Scaffold this active site. Structure first.
Site, PDB file in Angstrom:
ATOM      1  N   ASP E  58     -30.114  57.309   1.606  1.00 38.95           N
ATOM      2  CA  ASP E  58     -31.224  58.061   1.904  1.00 38.95           C
ATOM      3  C   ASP E  58     -32.079  58.486   0.286  1.00 38.95           C
ATOM      4  OD1 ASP E  58     -31.633  58.003   4.891  1.00 38.95           O
ATOM      5  OD2 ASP E  58     -30.413  59.356   5.063  1.00 38.95           O
ATOM      6  N   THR E  91     -38.672  58.922   3.265  1.00 41.74           N
ATOM      7  CA  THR E  91     -38.018  59.918   2.444  1.00 41.74           C
ATOM      8  C   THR E  91     -38.410  58.928   1.024  1.00 41.74           C
ATOM      9  OG1 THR E  91     -35.861  59.688   1.914  1.00 41.74           O
ATOM     10  CG2 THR E  91     -37.199  61.929   3.563  1.00 41.74           C
ATOM     11  N   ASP E 392     -30.460  59.005  11.159  1.00 47.53           N
ATOM     12  CA  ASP E 392     -32.396  58.579  11.252  1.00 47.53           C
ATOM     13  C   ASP E 392     -31.823  57.928  12.496  1.00 47.53           C
ATOM     14  OD1 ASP E 392     -32.331  59.272   8.811  1.00 47.53           O
ATOM     15  OD2 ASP E 392     -31.476  57.565   7.375  1.00 47.53           O
TER      16      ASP E 392
HETATM   17  N1  LIG Z   1     -35.392  43.242   8.575  1.00 46.22           N
HETATM   18  C1  LIG Z   1     -36.497  43.723   7.778  1.00 46.22           C
HETATM   19  N2  LIG Z   1     -37.561  42.729   7.263  1.00 46.22           N
HETATM   20  C2  LIG Z   1     -38.132  43.139   6.819  1.00 46.22           C
HETATM   21  N3  LIG Z   1     -38.625  43.931   5.915  1.00 46.22           N
HETATM   22  C3  LIG Z   1     -38.077  45.307   6.567  1.00 46.22           C
HETATM   23  C4  LIG Z   1     -36.461  45.016   6.948  1.00 46.22           C
HETATM   24  N4  LIG Z   1     -36.704  46.207   7.610  1.00 46.22           N
HETATM   25  C5  LIG Z   1     -36.912  47.391   6.773  1.00 46.22           C
HETATM   26  N5  LIG Z   1     -37.975  46.950   6.761  1.00 46.22           N
HETATM   27  C6  LIG Z   1     -39.676  47.419   5.860  1.00 46.22           C
HETATM   28  O1  LIG Z   1     -38.210  48.169   4.377  1.00 46.22           O
HETATM   29  C7  LIG Z   1     -39.402  49.418   4.456  1.00 46.22           C
HETATM   30  C8  LIG Z   1     -37.592  49.978   4.687  1.00 46.22           C
HETATM   31  O2  LIG Z   1     -37.358  51.517   4.451  1.00 46.22           O
HETATM   32  P1  LIG Z   1     -36.414  52.936   3.902  1.00 46.22           P
HETATM   33  O3  LIG Z   1     -34.788  51.950   2.987  1.00 46.22           O
HETATM   34  O4  LIG Z   1     -36.202  52.883   5.600  1.00 46.22           O
HETATM   35  O5  LIG Z   1     -37.128  53.934   3.484  1.00 46.22           O
HETATM   36  P2  LIG Z   1     -37.397  55.425   4.363  1.00 46.22           P
HETATM   37  O6  LIG Z   1     -35.727  55.381   4.794  1.00 46.22           O
HETATM   38  O7  LIG Z   1     -37.371  56.069   3.439  1.00 46.22           O
HETATM   39  O8  LIG Z   1     -38.389  54.855   5.809  1.00 46.22           O
HETATM   40  C9  LIG Z   1     -39.376  50.284   6.081  1.00 46.22           C
HETATM   41  O9  LIG Z   1     -41.031  50.355   6.044  1.00 46.22           O
HETATM   42  C10 LIG Z   1     -40.152  48.568   6.765  1.00 46.22           C
HETATM   43  O10 LIG Z   1     -41.207  48.079   7.101  1.00 46.22           O
END
Ligand SMILES: Nc1ncnc2c1ncn2[C@@H]1O[C@H](COP(=O)(O)OP(=O)(O)O)[C@@H](O)[C@H]1O
Ligand SMILES: Nc1ncnc2c1ncn2[C@@H]1O[C@H](COP(=O)(O)OP(=O)(O)O)[C@@H](O)[C@H]1O
Ligand SMILES: Nc1ncnc2c1ncn2[C@@H]1O[C@H](COP(=O)(O)OP(=O)(O)O)[C@@H](O)[C@H]1O
Ligand SMILES: [Mg+2]
Ligand SMILES: [Mg+2]
Ligand SMILES: [Mg+2]
Ligand SMILES: [Mg+2]
Ligand SMILES: [Mg+2]
Lengths: 211, 526, 106, 538, 525, 49
Positions: E58, E91, E392
């Protein structure tokens, strides 16, 4: 952490992006300091030494040497500017500005994961093209008195204020034309520069002899 | 032996002469220069590092000044006058400091010219009287019944803050809160926004979601889960006494010599709780709010009658609830009457915001207290928004108390300076020079506005002065954005007359006080 | 040996491994036995031990002498423990157990 | 031109005492090196020929043992990756009770091979995926390697033979006698209902007579002495009380209010008569042994001595509950006489001295009861602690056998068979994960290699012979510790066996710990604080 | 310096120095938190001062656990904390967008441009981007499949893929269990309990409650099949008189009588409980379970165990509501009028022992409105990581249910907003077009970081995705396996609309406020 | 959030004991003030009186 630190515990190491960040920060700091020197409208700096000596200056090289800096990249840039001043005698501030802007523009693309080798290759190709264009653009003119006066103006007006530069232009042009022999290298050792401390700054002049 | 003998104690330093006056004036100048760039609609923001570890990203002059520590007593006096201006009228804190600095700056010239400070002080007081007269002369009336004019006044007061992006919403919130807080009992008009206009900051959400509630919101929750969390038209009973079984004031000891006395005492404790709850229930309320604890048995007895109860509430929140819902806080429930029962609240909802429970008593009809729910990016942004809202509410209450307005953007400063210069031509004594000096020193406000706008100071000031030398040009100032002269009758920048009068009085009297000072003595302990 | 920026065990940890460790253990056991060698037999001699406070203990029993000896060597404390064991189970032979164990190790 | 400043950004923003490790070489390789160092530190104690380790903790408490979990517990491990591996070993100890050294060795070997795989060019994700696939394949293969079942848990001889292997690694010199003792103790426990409790086996350590004099007692032994005159009962009818053996008092406040001379002169006599009546009422039920968890009043003790009642006081409530389970009584909250259903019975209760320690024995004669006690003799406290650890391992092995009655060959045979099968599977797997699968298979070699190194023979010859014999078909052939030269023999016939659950859980936990260590890419260590432990640990 | 002139021991950074300090802090935070984004991100391992180990991914947890003492870092940490408190996600994207906005603003500020124009352009671009986000959201009826997709897109980014697949089912089932029609979801009705014995994939959903305490009397039944639940908040132990009474007696017999009589108050309530238990069930098939928020003395425990009643004491305060909603009884603060109607029902109650700890399970409820998730794993840090991941996921599913709109993920919406802002840029008057361009470039950070973490290169992947979106008009994101553009809506990569809106608002506000700061002061000493 | 770091660039590269005054307020006004003070010290000795 690093291999060197493991071998030498009391060692300072900057690896990978850290080295680039350090070098670029040093170059940008030098560039920020020396921005206000370029051109006749650049501001004038006053430098005080340890003993209390006062030195008003606007040169890039003089400013670099008498500026309290203890950085490696700054040392390399100072050496490059020192060589530039030693050989050609002018273009020290422009050297630092161009180096800093080159590094900043390179960082602007390196921050997107681009390897620096590609940027260096582009720099070399652009340097070759720019050198060709400079060869194309130069103005080959028989150096009469007017052209020499104009060049002396373009230098001294940046170095000093208006009337002092006007006096120094005539002084230096007349001295060079006096010592210059046709189809021979100019020996600048034959112009002795003497210092007297009894008149105004505009009273400096050229004597067709020796002091 | 034979320790040294001397008149005053050790570490008792003393300075006197022109050095003291120069130091005082320099300290005032430096204090003014600290916040000189935080004036006008184009003012930059500052980041103050609280020694406790917090961060104050603020543009308010008093907020910046009170967050710093100074050693020179003149700087302490400057901080004090900034606080005084903030408390008295609400805004103008960063203008009075600049004005006082400029007045002391122009006084130093005469103090260096073999002029006694008393003459300068007399000239300053005459100038202040004439400034007050001129400001009262060029004022204009305002009808408070016009909502649009009040909104425009609040906007002109908040164009210089970070809330000007949401200026319409901020003005509506401030005007609604000030109008709702307004109250009059026993023929005494009262606008107490300090106690009844509460600002609650909850980080998160968007700033556009912030609003003013027709009620009171608190960070509370029902004592028991089975208790109702949503009531349509609640009848509210407020208490400031525990619903528990507490010891008496006098010392008391029981002597048990019989078998059944212990259980009898416990049963009488339960019966006393039941009787207290029955006294509460006899009024048939819907919710009960207490400032002190409520025992679990009391909770059960109240729930048997289907009554919601909030356990522990601060005194200020309870007073706000009483004002909002028309209740009356009582202590002994046996004396509870129908009048004390709070009817008027139109909804009591206990919803969840983020991970916290909040109690809403909103939808009141004719409430005399309100909560301003602020939602935003983080704690510091919400704090700055709260400061701007405080400034707006203070300006609104100033206009409601005094409906007089004067032109802003330096127009008033230039008009008063020109009037003083014209009046000084009749003066023949030595007092005229400091009089004119403070007259043109009053011009520091338009100069600072121009400097912050980035435009050229000298030609704009010359043109503005030439314009003000004309006949009907008392309302000509400078744009804080475009850096051009403009009539304020068409720009719409107006500030309350009370604020300007307070600023001028504070600046002039600070100059007088700091000019009356010589022979600084320090080092003596309490 | 290398600095190993993050060390594995706690700083100051002392370790010994291999044949030299066992030889040192045997030598410590011999040293412990030497303290009670002379207290065996009709021609035995008493031992006087003074504590920190200053009280003196004169004894011929091996277990008492070993207990009064504040031994901190981990391998040497085994002889003290077996002397205590012999005293507890039987009551006589506290010198013999230590002598026999040390002689076995030697 | 004299100093290298910190790079702008996170490096300058870091605190004074913090540390930031990032990347492969700076973080992952260092973690692998630390884990390998810990595994090598514990390596030498693996197997029956393992060597005991003298460990002195921070309180100068001496531990000598070859138990991996105990050694790791007494070691002040500071590298957090090694901390994770140690926590995995402790979880294995809690879940099963044996195989901690296996977990540590497997994790170390896996991380070493992961390091070399990263060096040759494979990415961390590929290594993790290959390790997970190979672990799944190993868990699928493992049930096929089961050689024999427990098939009986009420037989002294069979249970002793089953537990013999578990307690051969610890106390290799004499494992038959300990196996018989633990088998008898566990067979007294484990009634007709299939549930078995580990805590129902109690260990009493009385110094003096050498471990060959130890025995198992169908009862409880308390290291104390009776508080009354009676010291032996032959038909014990114990009445257990949780309240102090005294007249109960008001919880609010006691105040003897005296207003006349008669009350003052009669109060003490009345209190005495009440106490005597209570004690006589208790004794009239037939009870002849009284056990209390509180203090014993002088008058109550006198009247108990008057009526020939044996008094035992147990300060610990755990011991009181264990005694209630052993005898069959209920701890009465008050001092009322016990009804016939809640009065426990014991076949013999007496005061005895073992060595130089006075003990109270609640002895049965039937080979049953809720709790059985193993009295351990010896010549050193450390030796008895080691024997107690061995008994604990044997009891956990019996509990595992009750949970699952499946066994796998020991002596490294199972590891060699698993390595061969996983290597064969990985040789048929196209893609980059074949290297990781082969390395996971090769990591199983560390067990027979450690056995050979500890036994004093050449590991390479042993492993080559094991591969030859397993390739020709024999799956139950393992290392032979009873030889001066590299030799192998059938482990099923030789009786060296390991529990299926132990191997399953050890493999799972070691793989999980290795994968978790590999997943870490950056480390941010805060400035160490030398605080006197968090309040949670007390 | 003026401030230094007043307070000599004061630190000041003015104008360009202030801007440089702020940009450097934001850039450092951005470079640290770049690797968190996406399921292909790298785990960060965090050791506290006491040596506690924390594996997490996170952004908010990382920011809280970095050893940073910077003012701008503190402000960004507060912004991320608010983001996590309200929405529970974004975040890392918050920090990345703030840092990239500041960098893009500095690119033009270093060329002599005043920051105010940049902030005005940022405001206009934020308004246009919010309009586009309203335009691009997908309004869908939230069935189980869409919620599962959202939970996957969260958990896969937050935890191992297989554990993410398990946690998706767990979280979605729990949310659908506790959710009533058109009523706000109370996440306090889901208990997140941690047990430390099994593997990480054994985490599951129990349609009831799990209590971290058990019966304190050994004779109590360890497992009752059909049980009546009595949730009460009544003390059953001896309590002092509030008036400091004390006893007085003149003989041992009187003392005994007083001792016996002083327990009558508690004995009456115990007798009421026993009588109710006898009335409701006269056979041994049914059972009685008493869960009390207040303590129970050993005498009452013995009295209850003699009647075959399982009694749990010192229950959690929220457990009262959780048991009331799940079992279906009534939480009682007194026993004055207790009736069989107030008794809850549980189809199975049993006690599970784990080391020194002891646990009680209450399952097989009729229609449990409150459930519990049993976090299981071999390590403490594993339990903490799973707890953060399930938090989350619960936040994401609740947000998706709250508003029937869901936004395509994988950076597709970021690219679409960037192109829309570029197209809208000519409509902006003045030099605010530079600010609009900076805002668009800053919004483009998410696909860049996703491609960088996936192993590909930023430039090629970004230009491929942008060209595909321009020529097709679809919402194409980043394929973290191949790097080619891909329609996130069709594959099931979903993002919360509220999270995106909060991201835009908070990032723009904080970036504008930081840009306009021209002085950092520390003069409070 | 309790210490203001030195700005990157020339501010950090400056030597330990050196001082750097730049701009109008930091340099020109200070120099004018120093010259004013010097003139003030010498002023009282001007003229026959
Ligand atoms: N399987 C996937 N394939 C492509 N993009 C993804 C996939 N899973 C998540 N994402 C993208 O990656 C990002 C994940 O960010 P994340 O690590 O959740 O940051 P935060 O926790 O701050 O939201 C999301 O904005 C999403 O659009
Ligand atoms: N849009 C504007 N154009 C020109 N001047 C303005 C404008 N808005 C406010 N002002 C002037 O700026 C001053 C307000 O500045 P502010 O930052 O509020 O300082 P203070 O807090 O001391 O009032 C007022 O005197 C007003 O005349
Ligand atoms: N008689 C024996 N001959 C050869 N190997 C044995 C014998 N007894 C046990 N082993 C091996 O020793 C290993 C037990 O090692 P041990 O020291 O118990 O470590 P742990 O306590 O972690 O299980 C088992 O894997 C088994 O194969
Ligand atoms: Mg030049
Ligand atoms: Mg103002
Ligand atoms: Mg003898
Ligand atoms: Mg073992
Ligand atoms: Mg996320």
């Amino acid at each position: 952490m690093a291999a060197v630190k493991t071998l030498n515990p009391k060692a300072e190491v900057a690896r990978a992006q850290a080295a680039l960040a350090v070098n670029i920060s040093a170059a940008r700091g030098l560039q920020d300091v020396l921005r206000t020197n370029l051109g006749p409208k650049g501001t004038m700096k006053m430098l005080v030494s340890g003993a209390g000596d006062i030195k008003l200056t606007k040169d890039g090289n003089v400013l670099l040497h008498e500026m309290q800096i203890q950085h490696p990249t700054a040392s390399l840039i100072a050496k490059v500017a020192t060589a530039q001043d030693d050989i050609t005698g002018d273009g020290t501030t422009s050297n630092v500005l161009i180096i800093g802007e080159l590094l900043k523009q390179a960082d602007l693309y390196i921050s997107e994961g681009l390897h620096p080798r590609i940027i260096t290759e582009g720099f070399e190709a652009a340097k070759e093209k720019a050198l060709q264009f400079l060869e194309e653009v130069k103005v080959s003119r028989e150096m009469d008195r007017e052209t020499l006066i104009d060049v002396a103006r373009t230098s001294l007006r940046t170095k000093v204020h208006a009337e002092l530069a006007d006096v120094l232009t005539e002084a230096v042009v007349d001295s060079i034309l006096a010592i210059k022999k046709q189809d021979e290298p100019i020996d600048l050792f034959m112009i002795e520069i003497m210092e007297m401390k009894h008149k105004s700054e505009t009273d400096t002049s050229l004597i067709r002899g020796l002091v | 032996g034979h320790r040294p003998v001397l008149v005053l104690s050790q570490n008792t330093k003393r300075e006197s002469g022109r050095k003291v006056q120069s130091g005082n004036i320099n300290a005032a100048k430096t204090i003014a220069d600290i916040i000189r760039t935080c004036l006008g609609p184009k003012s930059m923001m500052k980041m103050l590092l609280d020694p406790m570890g917090g961060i104050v990203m603020t543009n308010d002059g008093n907020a910046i000044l009170r967050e710093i520590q100074v050693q020179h007593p003149a700087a302490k006096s400057m901080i004090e006058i900034s606080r005084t201006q903030d408390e008295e009228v609400g805004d103008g804190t960063t203008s009075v400091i600049i004005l006082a600095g400029e007045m002391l700056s122009v006084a130093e010239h005469f103090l260096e010219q073999q002029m006694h400070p008393t003459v300068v002080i007399s000239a300053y007081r005459k100038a202040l009287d004439d400034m007050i007269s001129t400001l009262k002369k060029i004022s204009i009336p305002v009808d408070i019944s016009d909502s649009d004019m009040m909104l425009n006044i609040i906007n002109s007061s908040i164009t210089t803050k970070a809330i000007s992006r949401w200026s319409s919403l901020a003005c509506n919130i401030a005007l609604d809160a000030v109008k709702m807080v307004q109250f009059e009992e026993n023929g005494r008009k009262e606008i107490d926004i300090k106690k009844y206009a509460r600002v609650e900051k909850i980080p998160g959400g968007i700033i556009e979601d912030s609003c003013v509630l027709r009620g009171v919101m608190i960070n509370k929750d029902v004592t028991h889960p089975r208790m109702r969390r949503y009531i349509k038209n609640p009848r509210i009973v407020l208490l400031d006494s525990s619903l528990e079984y507490k010891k008496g004031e006098s010392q008391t000891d029981i002597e048990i010599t019989r078998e059944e006395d212990f259980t009898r005492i416990l049963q009488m404790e339960e019966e006393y709780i039941q009787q207290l709850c029955e006294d509460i229930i006899q009024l048939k309320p819907d919710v009960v709010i207490t400032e002190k604890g409520i025992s679990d048995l009391a909770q059960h007895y109240l729930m048997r009658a289907n009554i919601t109860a909030i356990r522990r509430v601060r005194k200020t929140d309870n007073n706000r609830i009483a004002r909002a819902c028309g209740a009356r806080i009582v202590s002994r429930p046996e004396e509870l009457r129908e009048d004390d029962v709070g009817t008027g609240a139109g909804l009591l909802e206990i919803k969840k915001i983020g991970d916290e429970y909040f109690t809403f008593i909103t939808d009141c009809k004719d409430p005399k207290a309100c909560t301003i729910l602020l939602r935003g990016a983080s704690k510091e942004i919400l704090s700055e928004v709260e400061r701007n809202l405080q400034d707006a509410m203070q300006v609104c209450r100033n206009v409601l108390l005094d409906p007089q307005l004067v032109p802003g953007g330096g127009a008033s400063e230039m008009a008063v300076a020109h009037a003083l210069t014209e009046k000084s031509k009749a003066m023949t004594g030595v007092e005229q020079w400091p009089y004119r000096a403070v007259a043109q020193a009053l011009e520091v406000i338009p100069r600072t506005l121009i400097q912050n706008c980035g435009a050229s100071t000298i030609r704009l000031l010359t043109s503005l002065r030439a314009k003000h030398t004309q006949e009907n040009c008392e309302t000509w100032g400078v744009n804080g954005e475009t850096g051009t002269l403009v009539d304020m009758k068409e720009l719409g920048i107006w500030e309350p007359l009370a604020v300007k009068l307070q600023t001028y009085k504070t600046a002039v009297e600070t100059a007088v006080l700091l000019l009356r000072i010589d022979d600084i003595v320090s080092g003596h302990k309490k | 040996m290398m600095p190993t920026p993050v060390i594995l065990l706690k700083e100051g940890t002392d370790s010994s491994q291999g044949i030299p460790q066992l030889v040192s253990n045997i030598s410590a056991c011999q040293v412990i036995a030497e303290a009670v060698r002379t207290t065996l037999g009709p021609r035995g001699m008493d031992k006087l031990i003074v504590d920190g406070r200053g009280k003196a203990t004169i004894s011929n029993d091996g277990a008492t002498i070993l207990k009064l000896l504040d031994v901190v060597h981990p391998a040497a404390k085994t002889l003290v423990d077996i002397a205590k064991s012999q005293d507890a189970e039987v009551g006589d032979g506290t010198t013999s157990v230590t002598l026999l164990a040390a002689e076995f190790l030697k | 031109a004299l100093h290298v400043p910190k790079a702008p950004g996170f490096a300058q923003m870091l605190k004074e005492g913090a540390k930031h490790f990032s990347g492969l070489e700076e973080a992952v390789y260092r973690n692998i090196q630390a884990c390998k160092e810990l595994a090598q530190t514990t390596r030498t104690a693996y197997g029956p020929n393992g060597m005991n380790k003298m460990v002195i903790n921070h309180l100068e408490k001496l531990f000598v043992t070859n138990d991996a979990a105990t050694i790791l517990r007494e070691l002040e491990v500071q590298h957090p990756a090694a901390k994770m591996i140690v926590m995995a070993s402790h979880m294995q100890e809690q879940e099963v009770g044996d195989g901690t050294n296996f977990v540590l060795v497997f994790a170390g070997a896996l991380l070493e091979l992961a390091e070399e795989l990263l060096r040759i060019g494979l990415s961390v994700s590929e290594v993790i995926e290959g390790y997970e696939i190979a672990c799944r394949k190993a868990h699928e293969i493992l049930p096929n390697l089961v050689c024999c079942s427990a098939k009986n848990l009420r037989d002294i001889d069979e249970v002793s033979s089953l537990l013999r292997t578990s307690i051969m690694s610890k106390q290799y010199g004499n494992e038959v006698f300990l196996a018989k003792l633990i088998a008898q103790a566990c067979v007294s426990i484990f009634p007709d209902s299939g549930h078995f409790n580990v805590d129902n086996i109690r260990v009493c350590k009385i110094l003096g007579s050498g471990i060959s004099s130890s025995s198992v007692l169908h009862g409880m032994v308390f290291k104390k002495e009776t508080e009354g005159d009676v010291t032996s009962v032959k038909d014990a009818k114990i009445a257990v009380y949780s309240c102090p053996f005294d007249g109960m008092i008001t919880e609010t406040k006691g105040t003897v209010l005296i207003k006349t001379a008669e009350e003052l002169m009669n109060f003490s006599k009345g209190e005495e008569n009440l106490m005597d009546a209570q004690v006589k009422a208790i004794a009239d039920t037939g009870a002849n042994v009284v056990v209390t968890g509180g203090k014993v009043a002088d008058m109550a003790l006198h009247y108990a001595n008057k009526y020939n009642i044996m008094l035992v006081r147990l300060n610990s409530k755990w011991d009181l509950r264990r005694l209630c389970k052993t005898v069959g009584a209920t701890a009465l909250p008050r001092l009322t006489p016990p009804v016939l259903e809640e009065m426990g019975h014991c076949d013999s209760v007496y005061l005895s001295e073992v060595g130089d320690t006075q003990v109270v024995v609640f002895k049965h004669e039937k080979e049953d009861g809720a709790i059985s006690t193993i009295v351990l003799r010896g010549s050193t406290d450390n030796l008895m602690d080691d024997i107690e650890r061995a008994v604990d391992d044997g009891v956990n092995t019996f509990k595992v056998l009750t949970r699952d009655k499946r066994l796998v060959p020991g002596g490294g045979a199972t590891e060699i068979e698993l390595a061969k099968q996983i290597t064969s599977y990985g040789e048929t797997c196209p893609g980059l994960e074949q290297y990781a699968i082969k390395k996971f298979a090769e990591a199983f070699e560390a067990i027979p290699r450690a056995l050979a190194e500890n036994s004093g023979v050449k590991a390479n010859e042993v492993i080559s012979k094991l591969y030859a014999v397993h390739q020709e078909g024999n799956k139950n052939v393992g290392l032979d510790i009873e030889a001066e030269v590299p030799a192998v023999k059938d482990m099923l016939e030789a009786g060296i066996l390991d529990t299926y659950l132990g191997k399953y859980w050890a493999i799972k936990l070691a793989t999980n710990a290795a994968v978790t260590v590999l997943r870490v890419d950056q480390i941010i260590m805060a400035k160490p604080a030398g605080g006197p432990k968090p309040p949670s640990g007390k | 310096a003026a401030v230094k002139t007043l307070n000599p021991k004061a630190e000041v950074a003015r104008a360009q120095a202030a801007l440089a300090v702020n940009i450097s802090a934001a850039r450092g935070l951005q470079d640290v938190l770049r690797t968190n984004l996406g399921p292909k991100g790298t785990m960060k391992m965090l050791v506290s001062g006491a040596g506690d180990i924390k594996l997490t991914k996170d952004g908010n947890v990382l920011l809280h656990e970095m050893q940073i003492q910077h003012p701008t870092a503190s402000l960004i940490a507060k912004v991320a904390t608010a983001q996590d408190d309200i929405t529970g996600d974004g975040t890392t994207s918050n920090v990345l967008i703030i840092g990239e906005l500041l960098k893009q603003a500095d690119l033009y500020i270093s060329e002599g441009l005043h920051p105010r124009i940049i902030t005005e352009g940022f405001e206009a671009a934020k308004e246009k981007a919010l309009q586009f986000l309203e335009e691009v959201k997908v309004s869908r009826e939230m069935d189980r499949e869409t919620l599962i997709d959202v939970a996957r897109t969260s958990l896969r980014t937050k935890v191992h893929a297989e554990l993410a697949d398990v946690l998706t089912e767990a979280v979605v089932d729990s949310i659908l269990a506790i959710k009533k029609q058109d009523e706000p979801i109370d996440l306090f009705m889901i208990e997140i309990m941690e047990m430390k014995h099994k593997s990480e994939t054994d985490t599951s959903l129990i349609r009831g409650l799990v209590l971290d305490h058990g019966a304190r009397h050994p004779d109590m039944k360890k497992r009752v099949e059909d049980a009546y639940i009595l949730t009460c908040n009544v003390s059953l132990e001896y309590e002092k008189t509030e008036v400091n009474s004390g006893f007085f007696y003149k003989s041992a017999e009187e003392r005994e009588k007083l001792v016996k009589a002083e327990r009558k108050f508690i004995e009456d309530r115990v007798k009421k409980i026993i009588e109710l238990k006898r009335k409701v069930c006269g056979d041994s098939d049914k059972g009685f379970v008493v869960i009390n928020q207040k303590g129970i003395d050993p005498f009452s425990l013995d009295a209850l165990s003699k009647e075959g009643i399982v009694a749990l004491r010192r229950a959690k305060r929220r457990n009262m509501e959780r048991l009331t909603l799940a079992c279906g009884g009534v939480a009682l603060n007194s026993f004055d009028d207790l009736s069989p109607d107030c008794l809850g029902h549980a189809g199975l109650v049993y006690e599970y022992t784990l080391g020194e700890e002891k646990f009680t399970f209450i399952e097989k409820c009729n229609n449990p409105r409150s459930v519990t998730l049993l976090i299981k794993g071999p390590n403490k840090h594993t339990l903490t990581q799973i707890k953060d991941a399930v938090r989350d996921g619960l936040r994401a599913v609740k947000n998706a249910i709250d508003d029937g709109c869901v936004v395509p993920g994988a950076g597709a919406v970021e690219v679409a907003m960037a192109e829309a802002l570029i197209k809208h840029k000519p409509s902006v008057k003045g030099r605010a077009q530079l600010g609009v361009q900076a805002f668009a470039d800053a919004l483009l950070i998410i696909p860049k970081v996703l491609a960088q973490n996936s192993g590909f290169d930023l430039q090629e992947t970004l230009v491929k995705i942008q060209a595909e979106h321009s020529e097709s008009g679809q919402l194409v994101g980043v394929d973290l396996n191949t790097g080619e553009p891909m329609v996130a809506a069709e594959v099931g990569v979903w993002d919360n609309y509220c999270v995106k809106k909060q991201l835009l608002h908070s990032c723009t506000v904080i970036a504008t406020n930081i840009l306009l700061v021209d002085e950092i002061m520390r003069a409070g000493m």
